[PDB]
């Protein structure tokens, strides 16, 4: 017996990265998983490096970031790499989740990797939120203020919880130092859950674009998907390069280069672009607590896809109506994103409400209806 199979440690690596049996027809949308692993590795390397030069104390934080940009050798690179990779991480995660929804990756027998995936997504949001506060510019402070005040809506105890989270009566030094510590930790938690969702997946193996079994025709992960992953790694690195070297601040907000000032409120407080759709959903509901519930529900409702999809077939490759509904759902999610950063003005207020209703009605009405009807069309159509 080969050492890679005999030795228990080597065999665990072997089972994931070498002998792992994969469908022979994964398309390029199966490459986001390895891009996400790459973002996670870049964020760990750059993040740990920034932590060697960053100071979490509110009197020094913003200046320690300027020291990184100005005095630390390649500090500008490490900082911009870290900041831009946070955006790339969300592009890859939206792509990966979109792949999963289009190809029915959430259906049995892959409910568990999908459900753990939904938690990975929440951990990414919290990680990135806390990391953004660490700069302690105007957007850092005011973003922390507004998002942490949503907790005040929790009945009875909400206010007490907010003061507890802040470690004081407003966002200040105690908040910044605790966000540093948690921002350092959360990526490690996230890596554990990323590992858990893969181990859970390994019981069924990867799904594939046709939605059928691949047990009939398997290909080793290496060398086929190793070398296929390199193409997208280099495509990603080219995009990374164009932002980090040629346009390092395109994805950011200029106000975050102004030091936090609790007195002056910035003209407009918007979240980082990747949180914008959830912010639009929150604005749609007039009630504070209503809005928070809606915003959270918008993520937790992903957990019911295994139930509301009534199809006897996995995935959308062969379902023209489901494909059109998916197209509308995705475009609506991008419209919500856009509406998250417009001013609260007519006519965007009502549009945001319509888009929010469409978002939820996909899960609760349209997908159950369309999936039921297509079942009947497949059966009658092929008689």
């Amino acid at each position: 017996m080969a050492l890679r199979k005999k030795n228990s440690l080597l065999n665990m690596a072997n089972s994931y990265v070498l002998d792992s049996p994969q469908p022979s027809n994964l398309n390029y949308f199966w490459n986001f998983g390895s891009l996400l692993a790459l973002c996670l590795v870049i964020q760990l390397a750059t993040g740990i490096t920034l932590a060697m030069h960053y100071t979490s104390h509110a009197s020094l934080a913003f200046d320690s970031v300027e020291h990184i940009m100005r005095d630390v050798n390649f500090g500008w690179f490490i900082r911009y790499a870290h900041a831009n990779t946070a955006s790339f991480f969300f592009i890859c995660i939206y792509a990966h989740m979109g792949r999963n929804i289009y190809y029915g990756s959430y259906k049995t027998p892959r409910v568990l990797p999908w459900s753990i995936g939904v938690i990975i997504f929440l951990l990414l949001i919290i990680t990135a939120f806390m990391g953004y506060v660490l700069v302690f510019g105007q957007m850092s402070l005011w973003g922390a203020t507004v998002i942490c005040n949503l907790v005040s809506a929790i009945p009875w105890l909400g206010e007490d919880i907010v003061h507890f989270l802040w470690g004081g009566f407003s966002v200040g030094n105690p908040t910044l130092q605790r966000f540093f510590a948690l921002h350092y930790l959360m990526p490690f938690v996230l890596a554990v859950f990323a590992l858990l969702h893969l181990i859970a997946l390994h019981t069924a193996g990867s799904s594939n674009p046709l939605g059928i079994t691949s047990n009939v025709d398997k290909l080793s992960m290496h060398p086929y998907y190793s070398f296929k992953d390199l193409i997208t790694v280099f495509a990603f690195l080219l995009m990374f390069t164009l932002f980090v070297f040629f346009s390092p601040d395109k994805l950011g907000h200029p106000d975050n280069y102004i030091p936090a000032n609790p007195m002056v409120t910035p003209a407009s407080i918007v979240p980082e672009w990747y949180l914008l759709p959830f912010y639009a959903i929150l604005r749609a509901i007039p009630d504070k607590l209503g809005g928070v519930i809606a915003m959270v529900a918008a993520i937790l409702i992903l957990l019911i896809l295994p139930i509301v999809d009534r199809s006897i077939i996995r995935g959308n490759a062969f379902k023209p109506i489901s494909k059109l509904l998916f197209g509308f759902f995705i475009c609506n999610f991008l419209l919500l994103g856009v509406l998250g950063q417009v001013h609260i003005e007519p006519p965007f207020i009502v549009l945001g409400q319509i888009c929010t209703i469409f978002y939820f009605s996909y899960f609760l009405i349209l997908l159950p209806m369309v999936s039921t009807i297509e079942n009947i069309f497949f059966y009658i159509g092929s008689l």
Binding site: F77, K228, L230, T241, L242, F245
Partner: protein, 244 residues
Amino acid sequence: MTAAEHGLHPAEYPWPQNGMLSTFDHASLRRGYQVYKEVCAACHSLDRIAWRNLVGVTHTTDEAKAFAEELEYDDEPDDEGNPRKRPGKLADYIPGPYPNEQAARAANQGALPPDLSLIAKARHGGADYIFALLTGYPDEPPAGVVLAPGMNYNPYFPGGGIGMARTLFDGVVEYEDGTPATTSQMAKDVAAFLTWAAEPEHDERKKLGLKAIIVISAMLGLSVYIKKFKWSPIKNRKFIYNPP
């Protein structure tokens, strides 16, 4: 929002540093420092820039040491623990005009002139906003505009009323390189210098990016060849089925 509440959007000017492969014009940087020093430094600090930062960008080691040595900085206390001053060194930061915000506001009818070290990155528009703002004070505010006391009309500034008056007029500076110091020229130079102050890695960053683009592109091309090479047995596979 009203367009006035937003501010007029600045034109896109063709800066020398626009362009994937373009550095700053260092002669313009040098001239822009001289505008900072002789006009802006009256009200605005540049606290993130040390004398050493100018060396080999705009000035030689000796010129920058001369600028430092003309100033006095706080030394460590003497042996009786009394305060002392020393002449500046290259490690010292360029000192600001005011001791604190309160003093700054008192000298500027309540308005606080921001530090200019990050201003090119801290405003939408960057260099174009700085150039547009400095050169965009109309002789007369548009009919109907009511300016608050101590405000000046400038359309590029959001709301229109800015607490900074026009400061650049033809020949307020005499450039040491003989360049005609028009309003436009000085605004261009100082906007360039401030852009440098906000992002001093600019020139090196873009050259390293050129190297990255080339290497990464080559690796992308080779990765495509290698993937196709390794996958060809799978792509080329053929079957004959004889039903049992």
